[PDB]
């Protein structure tokens, strides 16, 4: 009976970038509730003007939440390359939506290191747009069967960040929420407070 944005932004724990969470309607997109979490940077909404979002209607709205590090926040954008952009979360080049990222060193960092947030390091192919990969197969440096053995020329495809409060901003955790505005040939379910 309303758009529960807090459930995505006020959530206690975000998902790892290789297993990014998706949530998706029938509601009023009152985006002001997101400011309880302060403005950050680079809304970088592509194809969508956010000051018009309060008087626009869409079929659905997809909130993809995860956590990466600082110097990778720039990869969450159409047509970007890199570790996260190729092997974890891929945005399409015709992406009509927004990306809201903010520092969370206060939330996702512990003195011993938050090794719960993980990211994919090896993959034989680059990810298609909005494609999730939760594989655990050990990649082999070469063309051989590790048979699960993680060691010589046989690498665990996932690595942990290990966020600590003492890291630089380029290595500090950042919470990311990607908002995809789905306009299908169907009745609109999410309207702005001004319709």
């Amino acid at each position, epitope marked *: 009976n309303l758009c529960p944005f807090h459930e995505v932004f006020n959530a206690t724990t975000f998902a790892s970038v290789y297993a990014w969470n998706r949530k998706r309607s029938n509601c009023v997109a009152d985006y002001s509730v997101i400011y309880n979490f302060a403005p950050f940077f680079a809304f970088k909404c592509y194809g969508v*003007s956010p000051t018009k979002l309060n008087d626009l209607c869409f079929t659905n709205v997809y909130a993809d939440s995860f956590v990466i590090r600082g110097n990778e926040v720039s990869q969450i954008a159409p047509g970007q390359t890199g570790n996260i952009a190729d092997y974890n979360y891929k945005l399409p*080049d015709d992406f009509t939506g927004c990306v809201i990222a903010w520092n969370s060193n206060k939330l996702d960092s512990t003195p011993s290191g938050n090794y719960n947030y993980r990211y994919r390091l090896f993959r034989k192919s680059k990810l298609k747009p909005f494609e999730r990969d939760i594989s655990t197969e050990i990649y082999q440096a070469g063309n051989k069967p590790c048979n699960g053995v993680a060691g010589p020329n046989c690498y665990s495809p996932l690595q942990s960040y290990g966020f600590r409060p003492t890291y630089g901003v380029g290595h500090q955790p950042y919470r990311v929420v990607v908002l995809s505005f789905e306009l299908l040939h169907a009745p609109a379910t999410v309207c702005g407070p001004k319709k």
Partner: antibody
């Protein structure tokens, strides 16, 4: 895998015209602007103009207005740059460049991101008789 | 148009030295300044965008700084592969303009 492949080097007489192509692959063609930048032998870089790969609207630098025309073909994902009334000052290597997508900030203001992340290999145009 | 004065014209430094290049804009261009690297016979390669942001895959030894009219590009530890000509480019207002270029040479 973003690839920009330009046409071969050409030689044209002073006063003629030349057309350089730039075929794009590995990405959605119509989602990005395409810029052209020329570099004279041993000289610096000179921005020529920008074309929208979707609609075809163009914007040229003032010193090239009237001499340059930029076109686009979406079915082949190819951007063309034609320069007419060639002089010896136009003998140069011409690059097609792709920056990322422009965006909007919170106050609703259009934010341009014109840093050329991808480039073509260049095309040498020699103006000589 | 906005004019970008790039300094120096050329410089020679040893491997592992700190290299500093400057770019001054004729007017205030905020942080809309990018730094490209062009190797001989190659196309310019974007290293820095928006004054201080690193492009994907750019080593951490490269950095940028500045806002307004004065901008600085810094290599904290010069490496043999860093041989090239570096350019600064503004996009605060069209027509987009480039710096004169700075040729980096290595002393061995």
């Amino acid at each position: 895998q973003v690839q920009l492949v330009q046409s071969g080097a050409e030689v044209k007489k002073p006063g003629a015209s030349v057309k350089v192509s730039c075929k794009a692959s590995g990405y959605t063609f119509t989602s990005y602007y395409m810029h052209w930048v020329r570099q004279a032998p041993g000289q610096g870089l000179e921005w020529m103009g920008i074309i929208n790969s979707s609609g075809g609207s163009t914007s040229y630098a003032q010193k090239f207005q009237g001499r340059v025309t930029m076109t686009r073909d979406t079915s082949t994902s190819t951007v063309y740059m034609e320069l007419s009334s060639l002089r010896s000052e136009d003998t140069a290597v011409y690059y097609c460049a792709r920056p990322p997508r422009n965006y909007y900030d919170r106050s609703g203001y259009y934010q341009r991101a014109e840093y050329f992340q991808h480039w073509g290999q260049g095309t040498l145009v020699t103006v000589s008789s | 148009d906005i004019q970008l004065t790039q300094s120096p014209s050329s410089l020679s430094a040893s491997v592992g030295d700190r290299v500093t290049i400057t770019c001054q804009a004729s007017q205030d261009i905020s942080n809309y300044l990018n730094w490209y690297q062009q190797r001989p016979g190659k196309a310019p390669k974007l290293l820095i965008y928006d004054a201080s942001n690193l492009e994907t895959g750019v080593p951490s030894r490269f950095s940028g700084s500045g806002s307004g009219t004065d901008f600085t590009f810094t290599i904290s530890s010069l490496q043999p592969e860093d041989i090239a000509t570096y350019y600064c480019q503004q996009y605060d207002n069209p027509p987009l303009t480039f710096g004169g270029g700075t040729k980096l040479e290595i002393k061995r």
